[model samples]
Target: GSSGSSGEQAPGTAPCSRGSSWSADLDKCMDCASCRARPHSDFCLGCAAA
Candidate 1:
């Protein structure tokens, strides 16, 4: 497995958290405090449905 935003591109439906630093595993933003609070954990928000 790879580290940093170097795995896969987040899906188009993924919410534009309006932040920076993308997390490939979570398919979301690494800037989110909740997700990164766990320290190296991926949190999928299941963003947009349209």
Candidate 2:
């Protein structure tokens, strides 16, 4: 095992709830299912299906 020296860091903003992801286009969290169903350009990069 290795020891770590870096401290934990958190985002300035609250994270999206489960089943949702951050959407840069909408500036908010969007449902992964809905995002995946949308056009490729509109999908949430964080949670959309590969």
Candidate 3:
């Protein structure tokens, strides 16, 4: 993954595998707190929908 603010990427810091196993639960998408993206309406909607 790449580090540009607006481009195709994964977490700018590390590969998801380089993150926590617990992170796996939240790591499917890039907009999660673990990835440090600010929460979107879709982010909230996703948890509620689940």
Candidate 4:
């Protein structure tokens, strides 16, 4: 039997290093530079310091 529902899947390249995390919007892994350096934001899950 087949199902009609469909879902989105991530690519194998989504994995990031210890100091970074995968960004869905950027479609790539990102570090905390932009995340923590932002005026309003102070922390990020991807950054070890956060």
lDDT of candidate 1 at residue 10, scale 0 to 100: 57
What is the lDDT ranking, best to worst?
A: 2, 4, 1, 3
Stretches of model 3 off by over 4 angstroms after superposition: 1-28, 34-37
* lDDT string, candidate 1, 1-50, tens digits: 56556855655644455544444675555555554455444442422121
Using Cα atoms with residue i matched to residue i, what is each candidate's TM-score against the true structure?
0.25, 0.48, 0.18, 0.41
Q: Local error of candidate 1 at 32, Å?
A: 1.3
What C-alpha lDDT do the candidate models reach, one value each?
A: 0.47, 0.58, 0.38, 0.53
Worst 10 residues of 3 by lDDT: 14-23
lDDT, model 4, position 4: 72
Candidate 2: segments with Cα more than 4 A from true spot: 1-14, 39-43, 48-50
Q: List the residue pairs that clash in candidate 3.
A: none
Model 2 agreement with the true structure over 1-50: per-residue lDDT tens digits: 24765675533443666566666676876777775467464435556442
- All candidates: CA RMSD in angstroms? 11.6, 4.6, 11.8, 8.2
Alpha-carbon error at 12 in model 3, in Å? 27
Better of 1 and 4 by TM-score: 4
Measured by TM-score, the strongest candidate is 2
Q: Which pairs clash (backbone N, Cα, C closer than 3 Å) in model 2?
A: none
Choose 2 or 4, whichever is better by TM-score.
Answer: 2
Per-residue lDDT, model 1, residue 15, is 45
Deviation of model 4 at 47, angstroms: 5.2
Model 1's TM-score against the true structure: 0.25
